[PDB]
Design a protein around this nucleic acid. Sequence first.
RNA 1: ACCCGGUGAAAUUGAACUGGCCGUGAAGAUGCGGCCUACCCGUGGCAGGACGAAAAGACCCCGUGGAGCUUUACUGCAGCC
RNA 2: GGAUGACCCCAGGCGGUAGGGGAGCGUUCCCGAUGCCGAUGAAGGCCGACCCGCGAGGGCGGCUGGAGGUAAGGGAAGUGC
RNA 3: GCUGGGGCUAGGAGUGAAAAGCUAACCGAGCCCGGAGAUAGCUGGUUCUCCCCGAAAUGACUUUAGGGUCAGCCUCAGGCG
RNA 4: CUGUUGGGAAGCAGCGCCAGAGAGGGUGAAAGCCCCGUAGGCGAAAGGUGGGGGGAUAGGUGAGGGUACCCGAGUACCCCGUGGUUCGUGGAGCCAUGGGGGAAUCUGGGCGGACCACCGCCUAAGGCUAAGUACUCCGGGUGACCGAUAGCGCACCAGUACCGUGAGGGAAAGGUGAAAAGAACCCCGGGAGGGGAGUGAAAUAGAGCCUGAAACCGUGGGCUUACAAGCAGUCACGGCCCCGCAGGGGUUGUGGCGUGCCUAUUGAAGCAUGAGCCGGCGACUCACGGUCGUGGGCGAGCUUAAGCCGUUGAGGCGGAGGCGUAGGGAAACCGAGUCCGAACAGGGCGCAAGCGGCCGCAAAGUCCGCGGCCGUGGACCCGAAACCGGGC
RNA 5: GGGGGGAACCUGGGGAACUGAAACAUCUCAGUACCCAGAGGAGAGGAAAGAGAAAUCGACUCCCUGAGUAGCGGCGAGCGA
Lengths: 64, 99, 149, 107
Amino acid sequence: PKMKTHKGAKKRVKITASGKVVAMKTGKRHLNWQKSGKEIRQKGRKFVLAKPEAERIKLLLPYE
Amino acid sequence: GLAMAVADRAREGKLLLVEAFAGVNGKTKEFLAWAKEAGLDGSESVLLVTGNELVRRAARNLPWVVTLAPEGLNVYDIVRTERLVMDLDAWEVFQNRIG
Amino acid sequence: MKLSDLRPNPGANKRRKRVGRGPGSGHGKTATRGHKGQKSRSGGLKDPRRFEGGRSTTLMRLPKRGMQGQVPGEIKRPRYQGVNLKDLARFEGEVTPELLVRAGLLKKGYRLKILGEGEAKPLKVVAHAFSKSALEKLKAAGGEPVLLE
Amino acid sequence: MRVKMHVKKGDTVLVASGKYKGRVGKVKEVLPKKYAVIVEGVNIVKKAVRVSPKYPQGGFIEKEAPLHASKVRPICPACGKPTRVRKKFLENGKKIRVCAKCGGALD
RNA sequence: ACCCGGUGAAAUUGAACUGGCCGUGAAGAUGCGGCCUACCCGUGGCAGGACGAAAAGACCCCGUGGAGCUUUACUGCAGCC
RNA sequence: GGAUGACCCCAGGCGGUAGGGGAGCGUUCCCGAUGCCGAUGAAGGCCGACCCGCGAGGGCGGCUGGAGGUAAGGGAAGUGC
RNA sequence: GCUGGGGCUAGGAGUGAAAAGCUAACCGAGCCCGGAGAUAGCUGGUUCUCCCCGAAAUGACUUUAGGGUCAGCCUCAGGCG
RNA sequence: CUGUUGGGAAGCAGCGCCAGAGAGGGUGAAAGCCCCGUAGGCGAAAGGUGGGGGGAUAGGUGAGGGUACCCGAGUACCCCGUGGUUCGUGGAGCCAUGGGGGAAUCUGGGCGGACCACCGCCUAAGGCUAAGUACUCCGGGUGACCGAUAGCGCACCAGUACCGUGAGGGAAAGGUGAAAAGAACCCCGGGAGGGGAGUGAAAUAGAGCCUGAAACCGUGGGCUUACAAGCAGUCACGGCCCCGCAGGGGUUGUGGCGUGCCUAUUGAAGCAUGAGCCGGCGACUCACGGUCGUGGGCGAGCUUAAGCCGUUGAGGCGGAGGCGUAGGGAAACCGAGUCCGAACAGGGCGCAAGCGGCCGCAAAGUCCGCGGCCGUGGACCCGAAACCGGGC
RNA sequence: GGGGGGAACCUGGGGAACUGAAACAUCUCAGUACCCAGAGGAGAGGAAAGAGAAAUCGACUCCCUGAGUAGCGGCGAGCGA
Ligand SMILES: [Mg+2]
Ligand SMILES: [Mg+2]
Ligand SMILES: [Mg+2]
Ligand SMILES: [Mg+2]
Ligand SMILES: [Mg+2]
Ligand SMILES: [Mg+2]
Ligand SMILES: [Mg+2]
Ligand SMILES: [Mg+2]
Ligand SMILES: [Mg+2]
Ligand SMILES: [Mg+2]
Ligand SMILES: [Mg+2]
Ligand SMILES: [Mg+2]
Ligand SMILES: [Mg+2]
Ligand SMILES: [Mg+2]
Ligand SMILES: [Mg+2]
Ligand SMILES: [Mg+2]
Ligand SMILES: [Mg+2]
Ligand SMILES: [Mg+2]
Ligand SMILES: [Mg+2]
Ligand SMILES: [Mg+2]
Ligand SMILES: [Mg+2]
Ligand SMILES: [Mg+2]
Ligand SMILES: [Mg+2]
Ligand SMILES: [Mg+2]
Ligand SMILES: [Mg+2]
Ligand SMILES: [Mg+2]
Ligand SMILES: [Mg+2]
Ligand SMILES: [Mg+2]
Ligand SMILES: [Mg+2]
Ligand SMILES: [Mg+2]
Ligand SMILES: [Mg+2]
Ligand SMILES: [Mg+2]
Ligand SMILES: [Mg+2]
Ligand SMILES: [Mg+2]
Ligand SMILES: [Mg+2]
Ligand SMILES: [Mg+2]
Ligand SMILES: [Mg+2]
Ligand SMILES: [Mg+2]
Ligand SMILES: [Mg+2]
Ligand SMILES: [Mg+2]
Ligand SMILES: [Mg+2]
Ligand SMILES: [Mg+2]
Ligand SMILES: [Mg+2]
Ligand SMILES: [Mg+2]
Ligand SMILES: [Mg+2]
Ligand SMILES: [Mg+2]
Ligand SMILES: [Mg+2]
Ligand SMILES: [Mg+2]
Ligand SMILES: [Mg+2]
Ligand SMILES: [Mg+2]
Ligand SMILES: [Mg+2]
Ligand SMILES: [Mg+2]
Ligand SMILES: [Mg+2]
Ligand SMILES: [Mg+2]
Ligand SMILES: [Mg+2]
Ligand SMILES: [Mg+2]
Ligand SMILES: [Mg+2]
Ligand SMILES: [Mg+2]
Ligand SMILES: [Mg+2]
Ligand SMILES: [Mg+2]
Ligand SMILES: [Mg+2]
Ligand SMILES: [Mg+2]
Ligand SMILES: [Mg+2]
Ligand SMILES: [Mg+2]
Ligand SMILES: [Mg+2]
Ligand SMILES: [Mg+2]
Ligand SMILES: [Mg+2]
Ligand SMILES: [Mg+2]
Ligand SMILES: [Mg+2]
Ligand SMILES: [Mg+2]
Ligand SMILES: [Mg+2]
Ligand SMILES: [Mg+2]
Ligand SMILES: [Mg+2]
Ligand SMILES: [Mg+2]
Ligand SMILES: [Mg+2]
Ligand SMILES: [Mg+2]
Ligand SMILES: [Mg+2]
Ligand SMILES: [Mg+2]
Ligand SMILES: [Mg+2]
Ligand SMILES: [Mg+2]
Ligand SMILES: [Mg+2]
Ligand SMILES: [Mg+2]
Ligand SMILES: [Mg+2]
Ligand SMILES: [Mg+2]
Ligand SMILES: [Mg+2]
Ligand SMILES: [Mg+2]
Ligand SMILES: [Mg+2]
Ligand SMILES: [Mg+2]
Ligand SMILES: [Mg+2]
Ligand SMILES: [Mg+2]
Ligand SMILES: [Mg+2]
Ligand SMILES: [Mg+2]
Ligand SMILES: [Mg+2]
Ligand SMILES: [Mg+2]
Ligand SMILES: [Mg+2]
Ligand SMILES: [Mg+2]
Ligand SMILES: [Mg+2]
Ligand SMILES: [Mg+2]
Ligand SMILES: [Mg+2]
Ligand SMILES: [Mg+2]
Ligand SMILES: [Mg+2]
Ligand SMILES: [Mg+2]
Ligand SMILES: [Mg+2]
Ligand SMILES: [Mg+2]
Ligand SMILES: [Mg+2]
Ligand SMILES: [Mg+2]
Ligand SMILES: [Mg+2]
Ligand SMILES: [Mg+2]
Ligand SMILES: [Mg+2]
Ligand SMILES: [Mg+2]
Ligand SMILES: [Mg+2]
Ligand SMILES: [Mg+2]
Ligand SMILES: [Mg+2]
Ligand SMILES: [Mg+2]
Ligand SMILES: [Mg+2]
Ligand SMILES: [Mg+2]
Ligand SMILES: [Mg+2]
Ligand SMILES: [Mg+2]
Ligand SMILES: [Mg+2]
Ligand SMILES: [Mg+2]
Ligand SMILES: [Mg+2]
Ligand SMILES: [Mg+2]
Ligand SMILES: [Mg+2]
Ligand SMILES: [Mg+2]
Ligand SMILES: [Mg+2]
Ligand SMILES: [Mg+2]
Ligand SMILES: [Mg+2]
Ligand SMILES: [Mg+2]
Ligand SMILES: [Mg+2]
Ligand SMILES: [Mg+2]
Ligand SMILES: [Mg+2]
Ligand SMILES: [Mg+2]
Ligand SMILES: [Mg+2]
Ligand SMILES: [Mg+2]
Ligand SMILES: [Mg+2]
Ligand SMILES: [Mg+2]
Ligand SMILES: [Mg+2]
Ligand SMILES: [Mg+2]
Ligand SMILES: [Mg+2]
Ligand SMILES: [Mg+2]
Ligand SMILES: [Mg+2]
Ligand SMILES: [Mg+2]
Ligand SMILES: [Mg+2]
Ligand SMILES: [Mg+2]
Ligand SMILES: [Mg+2]
Ligand SMILES: [Mg+2]
Ligand SMILES: [Mg+2]
Ligand SMILES: [Mg+2]
Ligand SMILES: [Mg+2]
Ligand SMILES: [Mg+2]
Ligand SMILES: [Mg+2]
Ligand SMILES: [Mg+2]
Ligand SMILES: [Mg+2]
Ligand SMILES: [Mg+2]
Ligand SMILES: [Mg+2]
Ligand SMILES: [Mg+2]
Ligand SMILES: [Mg+2]
Ligand SMILES: [Mg+2]
Ligand SMILES: [Mg+2]
Ligand SMILES: [Mg+2]
Ligand SMILES: [Mg+2]
Ligand SMILES: [Mg+2]
Ligand SMILES: [Mg+2]
Ligand SMILES: [Mg+2]
Ligand SMILES: [Mg+2]
Ligand SMILES: [Zn+2]
């Protein structure tokens, strides 16, 4: 049968133009009050995943 | 495929376009004798194409003859045989194809 | 060029790897699975694309971004599509949506919008909208934009 | 319904092959379930028997062994040749067996 | 039980041309080393060895294996209110 | 070298389990086959101290057998204990 | 009390002067057929030939610890040189 | 048709003919022309079918106005408990209904994802309806389907013998030859059996019957063996035996060397696993989907699916749709940029894309074939203890 | 007129567990296996109180696509118009 896309993956990750995988930096969902402004802000930026894990994630989104 | 197949058979000289079949109204020995005046005594195999149940009927039953209608031209059958003896509307259906 | 001349090009039909067939062959006995463990077993190994030993999987530690939407459907609405200027060089005269579609340029059922990467050939073009800077290269290169509906 | 034969007892016929290729005689019997016949003095073999009343102080006897139907052809009582039968309708129009060679009856 | 005539099983069995000592070796050797001893084949008897046979250890650990039981473990259900 | 792997000269590498890559042998079936071998003997079986191949093999000969077998080149697998 | 003949109660159920006893020669939950090729991170077993390279038994995390994911190490195809 | 070889022609030979039929199968071996057929045509008094054609009948068919009589009741609808849906209480509508409350009859009512407004769509609480679809007990057709450990459990008198109280389980077992010509009669024998004889092409085709392997048992022959120590072999020399004419083959006296195979392991000859021996079955696949590689086709394009037509081992059609040509951003939205931001800082993710004089050459991409892998299925094969269901 | 039978195929009324989630309870297996009723050569459905954004289509059934899209989901495993 058709493979199914991992919905959890499609909700967390993005495939870029050139193949990279992209996600949101972890560690500002809570416990924020004491975290530095430098910390709090750097956790905005999307980050690129390291290839072996990115590549694995990729196989989970067959249709994109 | 269909282009190349015929294209090869011609390139070898073993093609032959014919206008209509003289003394042959669906009766083997007739065709048999027509083919004689045609330049094939069946020492080589013939792929034979025309929409003309009459012609290809006398032309059935012979070992060295593979019968065909012209919309049913196919590349196994071409290569399969030794000598293609097509025909003119057969030729235009085949030409209506490679377009 | 007969039947015993028909023959595939050099390796367009490889033979197949055949494990389980004696010593010399190279992969007999274990038949390449090495020795024991889950991954030997007739069955797997669970999904190598996400299972991480029982650990919290490297995917699911990552957060989730933005609207996932919810029942009943997705909102249906005007979808667009980008066709450039460098594309319309392959035409002369007027250019319309449905035309552009047939060209193998436009995905049908999306409202064409013209965006300008390139050079505007003196043309009349009909888009559902124009990227501000396609309007530019196009007008001043002697052409006529038709914002249609 | 009937093994379609091609021979009647007692058509005069010609063993067209075998040890007796060439013999000619009358079909004595036909056995359609087996599809073979026995023609006068064809396929003769010696059978051993015992000392009973009937064959008393016996010994051997001679028997006419059957023969595979196909392996025998009907002779035309006109044209006289071995042949094959074609089937002619009259005006009646009844079916007859008629020699494929001359064209006249075979009974 | 033993000898003669009659009938004739069984588990078990890698293959055998299957000795002792002291060593050695996956740490208890007919099979490796060095000695020693020893003609070939049986019958009746004995049980020290073949880590003899039998039973994929029943004890112990392991398995995110099972089942019977228990309760103030969890969560449900019947039953009762 | 020469001239598009024809074959010769030279130097060098060539223990190997898990495992990766390569090149091959054979079995069943299909196109090649309306063909071709075959009772002056098919397949199968039993010999061989001969021939070819590194090898899996393939030839060749003798006995047995008594009606089948099937090439060059390709294809497909219920393919090797 | 023992006993023949005729009957009734069965599978989370019967029957039990209580042994988890008995319920068609193995009952802490009968037998048959089915779901069904259940599941087995475990044990076995895995079949022709010849060529080239060639390991690992470490690290991190793991209801993980004889299983795995990523990294380390082998190999094949392309590229740099 | 004839000749020839042969037990036997259908082989081989000479000379011919048919083909709307050279599919297939038989006949003593290999047959277009001997047999059954094949191509092409023909056929129903009776039974059945009859969706095509013919006929007949039930059946059907106007416009404006007015009135406000009718338009499916314990129903809508609202609330509580559920179910269905992709929808697991969710913003939870819709459709279905167990319990309570309970209408209206076109200015009626249900829906358009809480609800309200608007703007719409539809007429619930009566019923029937062909075709296109599913299946295969049966009958026909065809296999890059099996050939008696295979294929159905069953080619055979098999749901049998047998096993179980029962439900239930469930076998083995095909072949003489062309033709029974199935061995008269004779001799040893109580017979079984065999020896002559007799048939046959063949009788080590003799019914315990084609072929007739291997383990296993025997008779005969050559070498060898009773002072010898062994994973049974190997190397070397010598003897005797055979084939032959400086060469082989067989056997083994003496000497040298030498720890079975598999498996599992750090490590096994191992006193760790499995195997009495032979034979025959026995384990990495298939489909759909991914991702690479690969041989080809086309290239800013590539490609059809289901189906329609055609052929019955002929291919064609069909552009619905799919991937590709533009990205960035949760999104609106913008676009060679876009996002974050007050920024026209700076960053993140993007765009710059191959060689000559339009062509070529090559390809981005896509389609098919093949090969390696991955995901879904039992997914390399045998294996539980158990769980659940209906029955006995 | 009914009653009983019939390889599957169909509708209805009921309806599991192993398994998956590498444990497990919501979830999965799955409205699957199976019991029962019924109908038939098929069966069910079927002439909109439909659909859902087109000021659009126009009974039902079945096929391809839509699309593993929208969504559902201890937002897990997976489920899926
Ligand atoms: Mg994202
Ligand atoms: Mg958190
Ligand atoms: Mg937050
Ligand atoms: Mg898609
Ligand atoms: Mg894309
Ligand atoms: Mg022909
Ligand atoms: Mg033909
Ligand atoms: Mg031919
Ligand atoms: Mg292949
Ligand atoms: Mg290979
Ligand atoms: Mg090998
Ligand atoms: Mg290999
Ligand atoms: Mg190896
Ligand atoms: Mg092995
Ligand atoms: Mg491997
Ligand atoms: Mg593997
Ligand atoms: Mg291990
Ligand atoms: Mg492993
Ligand atoms: Mg597994
Ligand atoms: Mg979404
Ligand atoms: Mg007749
Ligand atoms: Mg005695
Ligand atoms: Mg006795
Ligand atoms: Mg001794
Ligand atoms: Mg001693
Ligand atoms: Mg010690
Ligand atoms: Mg020591
Ligand atoms: Mg010792
Ligand atoms: Mg030693
Ligand atoms: Mg010793
Ligand atoms: Mg003794
Ligand atoms: Mg003892
Ligand atoms: Mg054990
Ligand atoms: Mg145990
Ligand atoms: Mg105990
Ligand atoms: Mg335990
Ligand atoms: Mg645990
Ligand atoms: Mg554990
Ligand atoms: Mg378990
Ligand atoms: Mg229990
Ligand atoms: Mg009670
Ligand atoms: Mg060398
Ligand atoms: Mg070396
Ligand atoms: Mg090597
Ligand atoms: Mg064969
Ligand atoms: Mg053929
Ligand atoms: Mg043949
Ligand atoms: Mg010949
Ligand atoms: Mg002969
Ligand atoms: Mg011979
Ligand atoms: Mg032979
Ligand atoms: Mg034959
Ligand atoms: Mg062949
Ligand atoms: Mg071949
Ligand atoms: Mg197999
Ligand atoms: Mg009593
Ligand atoms: Mg009683
Ligand atoms: Mg009682
Ligand atoms: Mg009961
Ligand atoms: Mg009962
Ligand atoms: Mg039960
Ligand atoms: Mg019992
Ligand atoms: Mg008992
Ligand atoms: Mg129970
Ligand atoms: Mg139980
Ligand atoms: Mg019992
Ligand atoms: Mg199941
Ligand atoms: Mg193993
Ligand atoms: Mg090396
Ligand atoms: Mg933990
Ligand atoms: Mg470990
Ligand atoms: Mg473990
Ligand atoms: Mg790894
Ligand atoms: Mg690598
Ligand atoms: Mg003669
Ligand atoms: Mg003749
Ligand atoms: Mg001839
Ligand atoms: Mg024909
Ligand atoms: Mg022939
Ligand atoms: Mg014939
Ligand atoms: Mg006909
Ligand atoms: Mg009124
Ligand atoms: Mg409700
Ligand atoms: Mg629900
Ligand atoms: Mg709900
Ligand atoms: Mg929930
Ligand atoms: Mg809802
Ligand atoms: Mg509403
Ligand atoms: Mg209600
Ligand atoms: Mg209701
Ligand atoms: Mg109202
Ligand atoms: Mg309603
Ligand atoms: Mg409502
Ligand atoms: Mg609506
Ligand atoms: Mg609304
Ligand atoms: Mg509506
Ligand atoms: Mg109404
Ligand atoms: Mg109605
Ligand atoms: Mg109805
Ligand atoms: Mg109906
Ligand atoms: Mg219907
Ligand atoms: Mg079927
Ligand atoms: Mg056959
Ligand atoms: Mg059988
Ligand atoms: Mg046999
Ligand atoms: Mg059987
Ligand atoms: Mg049968
Ligand atoms: Mg009994
Ligand atoms: Mg009985
Ligand atoms: Mg007979
Ligand atoms: Mg007596
Ligand atoms: Mg006798
Ligand atoms: Mg005798
Ligand atoms: Mg005798
Ligand atoms: Mg013999
Ligand atoms: Mg014989
Ligand atoms: Mg026998
Ligand atoms: Mg035979
Ligand atoms: Mg025999
Ligand atoms: Mg014998
Ligand atoms: Mg002897
Ligand atoms: Mg001597
Ligand atoms: Mg001495
Ligand atoms: Mg001596
Ligand atoms: Mg010694
Ligand atoms: Mg010697
Ligand atoms: Mg020696
Ligand atoms: Mg030495
Ligand atoms: Mg030794
Ligand atoms: Mg070995
Ligand atoms: Mg072990
Ligand atoms: Mg150990
Ligand atoms: Mg161990
Ligand atoms: Mg190891
Ligand atoms: Mg031992
Ligand atoms: Mg062990
Ligand atoms: Mg052992
Ligand atoms: Mg073992
Ligand atoms: Mg035994
Ligand atoms: Mg074997
Ligand atoms: Mg594979
Ligand atoms: Mg398959
Ligand atoms: Mg692939
Ligand atoms: Mg071009
Ligand atoms: Mg196209
Ligand atoms: Mg996007
Ligand atoms: Mg902003
Ligand atoms: Mg930028
Ligand atoms: Mg190109
Ligand atoms: Mg390409
Ligand atoms: Mg992979
Ligand atoms: Mg399994
Ligand atoms: Mg239980
Ligand atoms: Mg029950
Ligand atoms: Mg149901
Ligand atoms: Mg229940
Ligand atoms: Mg589980
Ligand atoms: Mg458990
Ligand atoms: Mg447990
Ligand atoms: Mg479901
Ligand atoms: Mg009924
Ligand atoms: Mg129908
Ligand atoms: Mg119906
Ligand atoms: Mg209506
Ligand atoms: Mg949510
Ligand atoms: Zn005549």
